[PDB]
Design an enzyme around this catalytic site. Structure first.
Site, PDB file in Angstrom:
ATOM      1  N   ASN A 297     -12.084  -2.807   4.530  1.00 38.64           N
ATOM      2  CA  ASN A 297     -12.985  -1.928   5.074  1.00 38.64           C
ATOM      3  C   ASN A 297     -12.057  -0.588   5.564  1.00 38.64           C
ATOM      4  O   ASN A 297     -12.285   0.501   5.595  1.00 38.64           O
ATOM      5  CB  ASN A 297     -13.681  -2.449   6.372  1.00 38.64           C
ATOM      6  N   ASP A 298     -10.819  -1.213   6.225  1.00 37.94           N
ATOM      7  CA  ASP A 298      -9.875  -0.092   6.715  1.00 37.94           C
ATOM      8  C   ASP A 298      -9.535   0.820   5.808  1.00 37.94           C
ATOM      9  O   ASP A 298      -9.399   2.020   6.256  1.00 37.94           O
ATOM     10  CB  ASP A 298      -8.780  -0.709   7.522  1.00 37.94           C
ATOM     11  N   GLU A 299      -9.061   0.575   4.577  1.00 36.94           N
ATOM     12  CA  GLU A 299      -8.718   1.010   3.520  1.00 36.94           C
ATOM     13  C   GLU A 299      -9.833   1.338   2.453  1.00 36.94           C
ATOM     14  O   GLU A 299      -9.486   1.835   1.220  1.00 36.94           O
ATOM     15  CB  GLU A 299      -7.653  -0.015   2.732  1.00 36.94           C
ATOM     16  N   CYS A 300     -11.012   1.656   2.662  1.00 37.33           N
ATOM     17  CA  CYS A 300     -12.316   2.107   2.125  1.00 37.33           C
ATOM     18  C   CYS A 300     -12.454   1.230   0.949  1.00 37.33           C
ATOM     19  O   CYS A 300     -13.323   1.707  -0.215  1.00 37.33           O
ATOM     20  CB  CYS A 300     -12.021   3.548   1.649  1.00 37.33           C
TER      21      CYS A 300
ATOM     22  N   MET B   4       0.763  -1.212   0.045  1.00 33.67           N
ATOM     23  CA  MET B   4      -0.232  -0.151  -0.097  1.00 33.67           C
ATOM     24  C   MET B   4       0.981   1.294  -0.070  1.00 33.67           C
ATOM     25  O   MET B   4       0.554   2.282  -0.540  1.00 33.67           O
ATOM     26  CB  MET B   4      -1.059   0.115   1.006  1.00 33.67           C
TER      27      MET B   4
END
Ligand SMILES: Nc1ncnc2c1ncn2[C@@H]1O[C@H](C(=O)N2CCN(CC(=O)Nc3cccc4c3CNC4=O)CC2)[C@@H](O)[C@H]1O
Lengths: 249, 306
Positions: free
Chosen positions: B244-247, A122
Site C-alpha cells: 500500500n505504501d508503494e501503490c 526498490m
C-alpha cells in the site's frame, strides 16, 4: 554473578536476547553500544514522543502506538566515521524485526545484503529510512502476541538528494556524486512544523500534501530515504514501543 | 428513460441498457406481474434492482447494498435474478469499478461454493444459456414446448437489439487480458497498472497454501491455538501495508477478497481492515461502503422486503 545495569536497559536486553558479571550485564558489554535511558518527563522524550504520534500515517489504521520507554543511543566509532561535512542532517525512522536488533546495535546499520536481491531492492542496495513513524513501524512485524517492537531514530547525512518519482533497482548507479536517493511521496511532514533536536532536523507531523504527482502514472504515498554508506548514519535514539492493534476476529 | 433514474439512484450504480430492455421483454410475457414471468417455466424471478422496477419497494430501515446480497457476493456482484433456492443459485451484474457499466453477468450457488462463473455479457444471454441447460433435464412435453416457444422470442429479441448470446464475448475475452489475478472465486481482479508494473504484486503463498492456512485456523481447538495459527495471516497483512505504501493496491484487495471468499467469521475483522482500505485507495469508494455493511450484516436470508 549480579547485574550492574539500570532495570529499563535490563528489560531491553532480555527482550533482544535468548561469570563475575551477570549475563544481562555481559551481553550489553558485548554490544559495544551505549544505551542510556531517558526520563518520561525529559524534553527529549516529550519531543520524540510527539514525532512518533504526529507521523502515524493515515493508511496505517490497523494499529496505534504507545511509547513505553526511550533510550539514547551512541554507537562508538560511528561519531568519528560520520560524514559531519554533509548537510540535510535529519532524524529518521528505521524499523526492523526483533531478531535483528543485536545485529543492528552491534555492527551498525548495514547496506542491503550483497546476497539475493530477489528481483532487486526498490532503490538498490542501500540503507532505508522513513519520515512517517508508522511507515518504519510496519517493518517490525509486530503481532497481537508479540506486540512490542523497536524503532530506531538516526541522524542521516542526506547531503544532496537524487529525487525520484518511481522505483529503480539501479538507482545507486545514477547517484553520480549526489549523496542519497529520496523517493517522493504524496504525503510527508512539511517544513512548517519542523523542529530541532540536539542539532538534527526532526520532520515533525502532521503529514500534508507534498504537491508531488507522477505524470507517467502512480505516485508513491510516502517518502523513502536511502543512503548507500554506513558512515552517513549515526544512531541517536531507540524507542521501545507497544503496538495496539484492533479486533483480530 | 425516465424510469431509469429511480432504479439507479437507490443502488448508486448505473445499470446497462439490457437491464431495462429485459424488463420490457418480461413485461411483455406477463403485463400484470412482469418479474415472475419466467418463474413457472425456468424457476427464475427478476429481483434486486428489478424489484424497484416492479414497484415492490413501496411497502416500507432499508439498505439496498444488502438487498438480495447473498453470503458470497463481493461488492462487484449485484444480484438481479434468483433461481433454485436449494443451491441458492442467483445471477448478478459484475462491475470491476462502480464507475463502469457491468462487464458481464455472473452466477453463483451460495449454498455450494464461492465461485462466480461467467455467464454471458448481458442479461438476455445469461437466461438463454440457462434455458438451454434446463431443457436438457426436462422430460415433460408441455414444459418442453413452453420453453421452446419462449426461446424463439428471446433469440429474436436479442437479435433485434444486437445483443450477443455467447457465454464468453469479445469484451469478456478482452477483459480477461486485464485480469491481474483470479482470486478464489475465479472472476478476476482488474486494477490500474502503469508502465512500471505498479498496482499489484502476488501473495507470498499459493492459493492452495492460503486455503491450507485458513483451515488450520478455523479447525483450531482453542482460542489460544487460533491466535498462534493467525501468525501467517498477520505476517501477510504486514506485507500488504508495504504494498500500500508503494501503490501496489491490488495485493491487499486479493488477500482481503480471498479471506472473504473462504467464508469463516474468523476472517471478518481482517477483511474489514483490508477491503475498505483497498477499495478506497483505488477510488472505488462505493465498494468500500458495500463491504463494510455486508461484513457488519452478512446473512443467509437477505431480501430486505421479506
Ligand atoms: N547489522 C545489521 N544487522 C541486523 N539487521 C540489519 C543489519 N543491516 C541491515 N539490516 C536489516 O536487514 C534488512 C535488510 O537489509 N533488507 C530488508 C529490507 N529491504 C527493504 C527496506 O529496507 N525497506 C524500508 C523502506 C523504508 C523504511 C524502512 C525500510 C525497512 N525498515 C524501515 O524502517 C532492504 C534489505 C533490514 O530490515 C535491516 O533492518
Amino acid at each position: 554473578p549480579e547485574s550492574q545495569l539500570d532495570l529499563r536497559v535490563q528489560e531491553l536486553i532480555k527482550l533482544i536476547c535468548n561469570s563475575p558479571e551477570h549475563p544481562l550485564d555481559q551481553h550489553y558489554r558485548n554490544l559495544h553500544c551505549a544505551l542510556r535511558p531517558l526520563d518520561h518527563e525529559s524534553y527529549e522524550f516529550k519531543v520524540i514522543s510527539q514525532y512518533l504520534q504526529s507521523t502515524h500515517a493515515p493508511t496505517h489504521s490497523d494499529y496505534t502506538m504507545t511509547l513505553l520507554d526511550l533510550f539514547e543511543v551512541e554507537k562508538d566509532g560511528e561519531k568519528e566515521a560520520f560524514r559531519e561535512d554533509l548537510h540535510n542532517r535529519m532524524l529518521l525512522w528505521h524499523g526492523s524485526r526483533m531478531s535483528n536488533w543485536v545485529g543492528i546495535l552491534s555492527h551498525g546499520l548495514r547496506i542491503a545484503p550483497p546476497e539475493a536481491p530477489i528481483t532487486g531492492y526498490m532503490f538498490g542496495k542501500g540503507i532505508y529510512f522513513a519520515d512517517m513513524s508508522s511507515k518504519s513501524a510496519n517493518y517490525c512485524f509486530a503481532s497481537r502476541l508479540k506486540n512490542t517492537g523497536l524503532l530506531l531514530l538516526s541522524e542521516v547525512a542526506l547531503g544532496q538528494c537524487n529525487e525520484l518519482l518511481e522505483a529503480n533497482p539501479k538507482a545507486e548507479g545514477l547517484l553520480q556524486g549526489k549523496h542519497s536517493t529520496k523517493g517522493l511521496g504524496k504525503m510527508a511532514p512539511s517544513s512548517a512544523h519542523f523542529v530541532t533536536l540536539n542539532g538534527s532536523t526532526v520532520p515533525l507531523g502532521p503529514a500534508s500534501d507534498t504537491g508531488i504527482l507522477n505524470p507517467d502514472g502512480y505516485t508513491l504515498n510516502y517518502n523513502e530515504y536511502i543512503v548507500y554508506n554506513p558512515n552517513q548514519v549515526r544512531m541517536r535514539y531507540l524507542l521501545k514501543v507497544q503496538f495496539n492493534f484492533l479486533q483480530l476476529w | 428513460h425516465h424510469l431509469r433514474k429511480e432504479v439507479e439512484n437507490h443502488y448508486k450504480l448505473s445499470l446497462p441498457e439490457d437491464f431495462y430492455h429485459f424488463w420490457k421483454f418480461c413485461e411483455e410475457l406477463d403485463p400484470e406481474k412482469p418479474s415472475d414471468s419466467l418463474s413457472a417455466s425456468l424457476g427464475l424471478q427478476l429481483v434486486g434492482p428489478y424489484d424497484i422496477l416492479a414497484g415492490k419497494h413501496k411497502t416500507k430501515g432499508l439498505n439496498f447494498n444488502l438487498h438480495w446480497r447473498f453470503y458470497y457476493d463481493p461488492p462487484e456482484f449485484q444480484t438481479i435474478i434468483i433461481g433454485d433456492n436449494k443451491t441458492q443459485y442467483h445471477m448478478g451484474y459484475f462491475r470491476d469499478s462502480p464507475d463502469e457499466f457491468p462487464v458481464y453477468v455472473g452466477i453463483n450457488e451460495a449454498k455450494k461454493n464461492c465461485i462466480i462463473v461467467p455467464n454471458g455479457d448481458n442479461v438476455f444471454a445469461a437466461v438463454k444459456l440457462f434455458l438451454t441447460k434446463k431443457l436438457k433435464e426436462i422430460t415433460d412435453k408441455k414444459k418442453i414446448n413452453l420453453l421452446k416457444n419462449i426461446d424463439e422470442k428471446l433469440t429474436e429479441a436479442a437479435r433485434e437489439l444486437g445483443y450477443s448470446l455467447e457465454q464468453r464475448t469479445v469484451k469478456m475475452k478482452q477483459r480477461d487480458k486485464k485480469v491481474v489475478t483470479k482470486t478464489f472465486h475465479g472472476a478476476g481482479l482488474v486494477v490500474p497498472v502503469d508502465k512500471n508494473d505498479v498496482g499489484y504484486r502476488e501473495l507470498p503463498e499459493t492459493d492452495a497454501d492460503l486455503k491450507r492456512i485458513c483451515k488450520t485456523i478455523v479447525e483450531a481447538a482453542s482460542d489460544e491455538e487460533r491466535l498462534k495459527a493467525f501468525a501467517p495471516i498477520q505476517e501477510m497483512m504486514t506485507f500488504v501495508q508495504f504494498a500500500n505504501d508503494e501503490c501496489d493496491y491490488g495485493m491487499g484487495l486479493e488477500l482481503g477478497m480471498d479471506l472473504f471468499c473462504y467464508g469463516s467469521h474468523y476472517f471478518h475483522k481482517v477483511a474489514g481492515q483490508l477491503l475498505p482500505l483497498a477499495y478506497n485507495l483505488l477510488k472505488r469508494n462505493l465498494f468500500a461502503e458495500i463491504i463494510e455493511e455486508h461484513l457488519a450484516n452478512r446473512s443467509q436470508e437477505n431480501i430486505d422486503q421479506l
